[PDB]
Amino acid sequence: MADGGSERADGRIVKMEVDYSATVDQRLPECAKLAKEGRLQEVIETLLSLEKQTRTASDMVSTSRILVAVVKMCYEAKEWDLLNENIMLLSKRRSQLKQAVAKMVQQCCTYVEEITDLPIKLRLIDTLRMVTEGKIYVEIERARLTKTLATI
Amino acid sequence: GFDRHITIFSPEGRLYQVEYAFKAINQGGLTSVAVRGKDCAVIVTQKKVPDKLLDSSTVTHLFKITENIGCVMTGMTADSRSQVQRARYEAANWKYKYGYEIPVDMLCKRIADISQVYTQNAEMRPLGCCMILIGIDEEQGPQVYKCDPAGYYCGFKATAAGVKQTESTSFLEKKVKKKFDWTFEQTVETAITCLSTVLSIDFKPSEIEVGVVTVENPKFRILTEAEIDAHLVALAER
Amino acid sequence: TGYDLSASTFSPDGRVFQVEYAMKAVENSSTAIGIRCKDGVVFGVEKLVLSKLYEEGSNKRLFNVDRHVGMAVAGLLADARSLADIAREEASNFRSNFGYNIPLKHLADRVAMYVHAYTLYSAVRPFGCSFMLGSYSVNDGAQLYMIDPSGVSYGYWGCAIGKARQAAKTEIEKLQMKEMTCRDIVKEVAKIIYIVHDEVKDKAFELELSWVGELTNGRHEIVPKDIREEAEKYAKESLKEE
Amino acid sequence: GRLDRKIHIDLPNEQARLDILKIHAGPITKHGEIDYEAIVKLSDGFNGADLRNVCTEAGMFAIRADHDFVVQEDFMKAVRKVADSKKLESKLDYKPV
Amino acid sequence: SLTTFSPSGKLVQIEYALAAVAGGAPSVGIKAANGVVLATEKKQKSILYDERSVHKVEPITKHIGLVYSGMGPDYRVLVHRARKLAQQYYLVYQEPIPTAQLVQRVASVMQEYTQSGGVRPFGVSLLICGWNEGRPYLFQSDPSGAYFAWKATAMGKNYVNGKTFLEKRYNEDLELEDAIHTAILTLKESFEGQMTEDNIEVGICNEAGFRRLTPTEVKDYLAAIA
Amino acid sequence: SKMNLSEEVDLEDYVARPDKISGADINSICQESGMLAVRENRYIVLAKDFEKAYKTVIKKDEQEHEFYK
């Protein structure tokens, strides 16, 4: 409900590296429930930012190892389904989705300096799937530009 | 002498009393919906109790017309029970003079003819209820039929009857557009969500009546409260 | 208008006004309360005496349609007598054909069919009486039902009909009749009758109380005189102290 | 082209009636032992305004017999009091064509 | 009702009956040298309905068929009466009934049902086809009971333009079953959305008898042909 | 021609729908479909908007009982 689950998520990021992906898949629906709460507009957005930073930490761990394409496709599928599994349009479209978008594009900015052509092109097409209809979408919207520049 | 009171043709032959009967059906503020699955059929009807003094077990709109067929009513209650008893009579008559479980279409056809001869003559009220049958037929699977007081009927993959008719039909059509082998618990979940989004009430389990007839259990049965709330908490998260 | 003088014609909105006039004629009459106890059914009705010239006990609205079934009347009394005769002969036909005491729900269904058949055509008017049926047995417990002239037969823990029906069922609901025995039910029903009598709106009145249950061994009967004549007694302690 | 969007307002729902009467439960003095669900359940087809009349009419029950507070019962009879008062209605939906 | 003569000598009740029929479903019939085709259009209100559940054509026997325009339950009860009447003709006679005989039987039935008081007269018009003694037969019956012989006709919605179109078409010498394609054209002239697998019903009566067409060949004739 | 209609938004499935839609209300259909698209903070209209957009505006259900037909 409140940010307490966030530090519970801290426990959830203690042993996640020790085991494999199904632990992340099992702590996923708890984050889904917290996103499904939606207490007061952006009161829930702290929990949304917390689960986004945990999944991007998992992204760091999984892209550090070979499991690069799988985590990317699973994560893009989950954030696209976040409209329907949680409240519609990731329950706010902004300040909890905006932090998600910024975190994913800075993850791409980390990855462009380290990964080869195959994972970078899969990651960029996965981002372009979201780019076609939805991003932070307030008054800048320019991270899609700054990364399609990286694509080209 | 004009036909606005008695069943006679009009300029452009408009029999006003039959639409008047349709509005009389819509006077009773209740709704039912029937959905046929791959091997199952479900009728979900909402009910309202004004007070706790009345015995809630006495109010029931679902009736076991035969051991394998279920029926449900909408309109004024007394005429509903009257045509329930008439359909019961004709079903038992068919079983006695033929010796087998009557198919759903034959009951539907006979009481359609009864409604037609009601509306054919004068000095007879043309009745004010609509009817839904659910059943199983051998080498046919589940069947869901509907009758009006005018005597019309058809075959339906799924339909509904009540005050909030049209939005129910639209929701059901946009759901059956992606039909793809409806399954039993999924059928009752979809029917419950359909009734919920039509009424926008998010009903508690003790406000509803569910009746399921299945190929696996060809005997028609009545859902109890326990499995009702089990399906509700099954559909609570989704 | 021309669309309210027949029981077979329809209003444009989908309504029948003859049966609505029948409902108004029923609610014009005085009150009556049926109640289901833990063991049986109690009927409490009040009847207004029109003049002292009556020899008392005239036109009592409580009738014994069956040995094990009692019934209560509001509305028009002649139609009530006709329905009582119909109920008696139908119970007779049942126990002739079947050989056991008829269930209350079954005979309620039959009289519902009978009263609804007279709404169908225009040659016969709808009835002007709403009635209640109470019964008890060990095979099924205590059963109570209420039927209006339109043909709606509903079971009740406690039901009321009449002019003061609103406050009657109001004070019915504020009692937990599922836990009280028949002796308490008598005093509760008497108290509610005395409350809803309304005093100034009518002349002097008289009380009628009827019993069915295991105390009466399932056979419906009127209350004894010693159980009677105490309704006023605990009324007078329970009257308002101004 | 002339009038773009048509907006219907229906009779208030049970939770809507609950919230409306709670809004009209602002200026109330009484002892709080009230099940609002009972009034909600007894309410059916009621306006968005007649609930405030129900509050007012339980208030005039309180104003007789010198009751500064309101007892819990005065609401339900008030519902009955409004019920027969709307037994003389027309009940015409009058949908737009 | 006990309807009687107007001061104009016209029965307003049967005029109302034919007016209600004229607003009914469009349908067409044609008599070719090898039999009779009947055809009708059923526009299902939604996808929810089952086309195979209720039909618009019904076999009275192995060689007699009748489509209709107008009321539904009236049509089905008249199907019951026609089937039963033809059956007692076969009971007394032990030979299959010829078309024209059951034509005047049902026309008579219309005459008493519009003559007897209390009952509102019927609001349907019927089209009858059969193969009797090699010569095919197609007739039309109105609610008033005046039966007509037609080798090609259209009854229902926008029937006059269909009648003019079959006046331009239908040289009445089509020995083959090409007139069914003409009936498909006549229905397509008034078809609402598209000529589909189920909206159009077609029935044939040939020397082998009357046989309701399977919707497979209905989709076949819908394809390629028009 | 002035709208987004991203890659697959069909129109010929909508031209076959009966019941005599007028000329002015097509402008209304496109207008409130864009309203639906902008409420969800999306700059490109998708095909999943148009069916609820269509059922929002016309709303004429049946007005003719089918046995009469």
- The reply to whether residue D4 touches residue F28, judged by beta carbons under 8 angstroms, is yes
**Cβ neighbour number for residue A32 with a 10 Å cutoff:** 16
Q: Which chain D residues are Cβ-neighbours of C21 within 8 angstroms?
A: none
Compute, in degrees rounded to 10, the torsion defined by CA atoms C63, C69, C72, C78: -50
Give domain limits for chain C. Answer: 1-238
How far is Cα B105 from Cα B84, in angstroms, rounded to an integer? 16
- Encoded tokens for B56: 């809630």
- The answer to whether E17 and B15 have CB atoms below 8 angstroms apart is no
Contacts of E among chains (3+ CB pairs under 8 A) = B, F
- The reply to whether residue D77 touches residue C166, judged by beta carbons under 8 angstroms, is yes
How far is Cα A32 from Cα C192, in angstroms, rounded to an integer? 57
Q: What is the DSSP string of C156-213?
A: BSEEEESTTHHHHHHHHHTS-TTT--HHHHHHHHHHHHHHHT-GGGS--EEEEEEEES
Residue in F13, F62, F67 to test binding to B, most B beta-carbons within 10 Å = F67
- The answer to whether B197 and B171 have CB atoms below 8 angstroms apart is yes
- Distance from the Cα of C217 to chain D's closest Cα (Å) equals 38
B140 touches chain E (CB under 8 A): no
- Domain limits at B229? 1-238
Residue in chain B lying closest to C152 (CA):
B78
CATH number, domain containing residue B140: 3.60.20.10
Q: In what order do the strands lie in the sheet with C32-36?
A: C158-161, C32-36, C41-48, C205-212, C221-222
- Cβ burial, residue C201 (10 Å; 0-12/13-18/19+): exposed
- The tokens 């326990």 sit on which residue? B226
Chains D vs E: touching, with 3+ CB pairs under 8 Å? no
Give the contacts of D95 (CB within 8 A, at least 6 positions apart): none
- The reply to whether residue F62 touches residue B166, judged by beta carbons under 8 angstroms, is yes
Please provide the size of chain E in residues.
226
Among E24, E193, E194, whose Cβ lies nearest the Cβ of F69?
E24
Give the contacts of E76 (CB within 8 A, at least 6 positions apart): B109, B112, B113, B116
Domain C1-238, CATH: 3.60.20.10
Among C14, C116, C157, whose Cβ lies nearest the Cβ of B55?
C157
How far is Cα B120 from Cα B109, in angstroms, rounded to an integer? 16
β-pair partners for B70: B134
- The answer to whether B139 and E97 have CB atoms below 8 angstroms apart is no
Among B150, B165, B170, whose Cβ lies nearest the Cβ of F67?
B150
- The reply to whether residue E48 touches residue B7, judged by beta carbons under 8 angstroms, is no
B21 touches chain C (CB under 8 A): yes
- The answer to whether E177 and E30 have CB atoms below 8 angstroms apart is no
* Amino acid (1-letter code) at residue B57: S
- The answer to whether B105 and B76 have CB atoms below 8 angstroms apart is no
- Distance from the Cα of B7 to chain C's closest Cα (Å) equals 9
Q: Which chain E residues are Cβ-neighbours of B172 within 8 angstroms?
A: 48
- Distance from the Cα of D80 to chain C's closest Cα (Å) equals 7
Q: Which chain F residues are Cβ-neighbours of B118 within 8 angstroms?
A: none
Among B48, B50, B200, whose Cβ lies nearest the Cβ of D13?
B200
Q: In what order do the strands lie in the sheet with E200-206?
A: E152-155, E27-32, E35-41, E200-206, E209-212
* Resolution of the structure in the document, Å: 4.3
For chain E, what is the domain count?
Answer: 1
Residue E102: helix, strand or coil by DSSP? helix
- The reply to whether residue F67 touches residue E73, judged by beta carbons under 8 angstroms, is yes
How far is Cα C59 from Cα C81, in angstroms, rounded to an integer? 10
How far is Cα D51 from Cα D82, in angstroms, rounded to an integer? 9
Residue in chain F lying closest to E156 (CA):
F69
- Encoded tokens for B73: 């009513």
Q: Which chain C residues are Cβ-neighbours of D73 within 8 angstroms?
A: 174
- Encoded tokens for A48: 């949304």
Q: Which chain C residues are Cβ-neighbours of B48 within 8 angstroms?
A: none
Residue in chain C lying closest to B59 (CA):
C154
- Distance from the Cα of F10 to chain E's closest Cα (Å) equals 17
Compute, in degrees rounded to 10, the torsion defined by CA atoms D21, D22, D26, D29: 90
Which chain C residues touch D if contact means CB-CB below 8 Å?
13, 166-167, 170, 174
How far is Cα B36 from Cα B31, in angstroms, rounded to an integer? 17
- Distance from the Cα of A111 to chain F's closest Cα (Å) equals 28
β-pair partners for C141: C137
How far is Cα B33 from Cα C233, in angstroms, rounded to an integer? 56
- Domain limits at E124? 1-225
- The reply to whether residue D4 touches residue F25, judged by beta carbons under 8 angstroms, is no
Give the contacts of C104 (CB within 8 A, at least 6 positions apart): C69, C133, C134, C135, C143, C144, C145
* Amino acid (1-letter code) at residue C209: L
Assign 3-state DSSP to chain A and report helix, strand, coil percentages, each to 5.
Answer: 70, 0, 30
Q: For C122, what's the count of Cα atoms within 13 Å in the CB-facing half-sphere?
A: 18
- The reply to whether residue D1 touches residue F31, judged by beta carbons under 8 angstroms, is no
Residue in chain F lying closest to D2 (CA):
F24
For chain B, what is the domain count?
Answer: 1
How far is Cα D50 from Cα A42, in angstroms, rounded to an integer? 37
CA E23 from centre of chain:
15
Element (H, E) at E149: strand E147-149
How far is Cα B233 from Cα C95, in angstroms, rounded to an integer? 48
Which chain B residues touch F if contact means CB-CB below 8 Å?
15, 18-19, 22, 148, 150-152, 165-166, 170, 174
Residue in chain B lying closest to E14 (CA):
B9
Instruction: Report the candidate in E141, E35, E26 with the shortest Cα–Cα distance to residue E78.
Output: E141
β-pair partners for B161: B32
- Distance from the Cα of B203 to chain C's closest Cα (Å) equals 24
- Distance from the Cα of B50 to chain D's closest Cα (Å) equals 6
B110 touches chain E (CB under 8 A): no
- The reply to whether residue B123 touches residue C2, judged by beta carbons under 8 angstroms, is no
- The reply to whether residue D14 touches residue B201, judged by beta carbons under 8 angstroms, is yes
Q: What is the DSSP string of C224-241?
A: PTTTSS-HHHHHHHHS--
The three-state DSSP-derived secondary structure of C118-134 is HHHCCCCCCCCEEEEEE
How many inter-chain contacts (B to D, CB under 8 Å) are there?
Answer: 8
F46 touches chain A (CB under 8 A): yes
- The reply to whether residue E45 touches residue F18, judged by beta carbons under 8 angstroms, is no
How far is Cα E177 from Cα E206, in angstroms, rounded to an integer? 10
Instruction: Report the candidate in E150, E120, E114 with the shortest Cα–Cα distance to residue E36.
Output: E150
CATH number, domain containing residue E182: 3.60.20.10
What b-and-e string marks burial along E22-54, b requiring 16 or more CB atoms within 10 Å of the CB? bbbbbbbbbbbebbbbbbbbbeeeeebbbbeeb
Residue in chain F lying closest to A93 (CA):
F41
- Distance from the Cα of B87 to chain C's closest Cα (Å) equals 14
- The reply to whether residue E23 touches residue B13, judged by beta carbons under 8 angstroms, is yes
Please provide the size of chain F in residues.
69
Among D13, D14, D42, whose Cβ lies nearest the Cβ of B50?
D42
Residue in chain B lying closest to E122 (CA):
B120
- The reply to whether residue B151 touches residue E54, judged by beta carbons under 8 angstroms, is no
- The answer to whether B118 and B127 have CB atoms below 8 angstroms apart is yes
